[PDB]
Amino acid sequence: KRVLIKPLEPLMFRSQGEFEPLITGSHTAAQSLIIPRPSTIAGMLGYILFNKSSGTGDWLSDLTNLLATIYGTFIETNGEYLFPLRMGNHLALVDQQHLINLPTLLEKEYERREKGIYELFYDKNKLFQIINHQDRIGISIDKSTRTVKEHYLYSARYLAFKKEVNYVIFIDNDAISDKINGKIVNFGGENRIAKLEVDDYKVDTSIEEEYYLALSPILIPDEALDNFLDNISDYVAMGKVDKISLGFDIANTKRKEMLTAILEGSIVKRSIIDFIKNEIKNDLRYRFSKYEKIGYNTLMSLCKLALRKILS
């Protein structure tokens, strides 16, 4: 039911693309996401569960045939759980006990709101006690001069883990356990390695509250984008909205689609569930249903570890 992904060494999940030497008189550089996107985690299990007799040009019609349904990802150090929390470009790894009073916090008076929010991302933010940015710098050597090439230098801020950390997901499938278990995986990045571990864990499947946490990017179907962005306060209480690419598919070596999403760790109001349903058309509902299977539209209650969905 529950899958722990144990990184054996610093990882890198880069966004923003174009990490390779193209321009002559210039270095390259890449950062890393603190939490891997669900496309990354889906592609990892899809890599284990791969049979050539499938797909032929799909990468999600092909992917959704392998895994049943994945739920969003968070952190687990020592049996504690930490969850992404996002603000106006600030990201924090906050503990479960601090999300309870967010809806009352986001509604307080001006000065009492800022103080409460400020202390969440600075004092009660447990990210930097758990994760450090190891800014590795690499180099390409030409065997002719046996020195560095013309500006073939790159900086890659890896994801160093000060403590023991796992990424936590849940799968609807149970025939999946004895397949992806104890497996050494090439957890997406610069050829890095993590270990997989499956154990049972009972959590809710569907709930109703007035404020959810986005435990995974909530994809916006690019057709409601106008009727959604013009009135954003009706849907997102706090967090970050931006255009993201869904990744890079292996079987075709192509960058996946690029569509606006609500980044994981945002606080979405209940108004976001019905809005999506009443804006997504069945032309794409069959598509966005798959996007949910790999783990994108995953919501969490600020109460407790209860995992909802949007189209499900």
């Binding site: 309870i100 809806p103 009352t104 509604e107 307080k108 008076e109 009492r112 109703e208 509250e209 007035e210 209650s301 109460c303 407790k304």
Partner: protein, 173 residues
């Protein structure tokens, strides 16, 4: 100072009219300024019982209960079964507000001792039931606002957002 009491807004009996005392002066916390209900109060960790219509102090932060705050006093047919305390309004977690408050108020809460008669099991309860939307307005909202079903009102929004904002966790026992 001020005298305000709380009343929950479920779909049930015994809640028709309890306050026995209305504005008296010119004060109201909850309001209907023809843009919707403002300054709704919500209590975290409390459940309502249709039996002995009042609240019970559970210990689940999920069990929220939405009601209204108007000026008034207990029915004094009980005078005991209510909780009374003075919490500044800033301490009171409200809903889509209109303004600030006197910052020092005396609030009354319909209460029940935890009722260890049975194990608690709360469940969220809906209020669609349009025919039960009608009755609670003239039951509760009229003894505090009789102006609704009069000269001008945009009924199709105000008793529409009641179906859109209010909810709670009952006990179903």
């Amino acid at each position: 100072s001020t005298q305000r009491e709380y009343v929950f807004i479920p779909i049930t009996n015994s809640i028709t009219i309890d306050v026995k005392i209305t504005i008296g002066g010119s004060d109201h916390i909850t309001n209907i300024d023809e843009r919707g209900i403002h300054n709704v109060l919500v209590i975290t960790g409390y459940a309502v019982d249709e039996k002995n219509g009042r609240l019970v102090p559970t210990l689940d932060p999920c069990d929220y209960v939405k009601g209204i705050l108007v000026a008034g006093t207990p029915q004094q047919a009980q005078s005991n079964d209510f909780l009374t305390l003075k919490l500044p309004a800033n301490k009171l977690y409200l809903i889509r507000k209109k303004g600030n408050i006197s910052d020092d108020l005396k609030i009354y809460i319909p209460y029940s001792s935890p009722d260890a008669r049975n194990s608690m099991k709360t469940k969220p309860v809906s209020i669609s039931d349009d025919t039960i939307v009608n009755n609670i307005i003239k039951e509760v909202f009229d003894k505090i606002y009789n102006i609704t079903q009069k000269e001008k009102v945009k009924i199709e929004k105000v008793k529409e957002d009641i179906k859109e904002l209010f909810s709670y966790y009952a006990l179903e026992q």
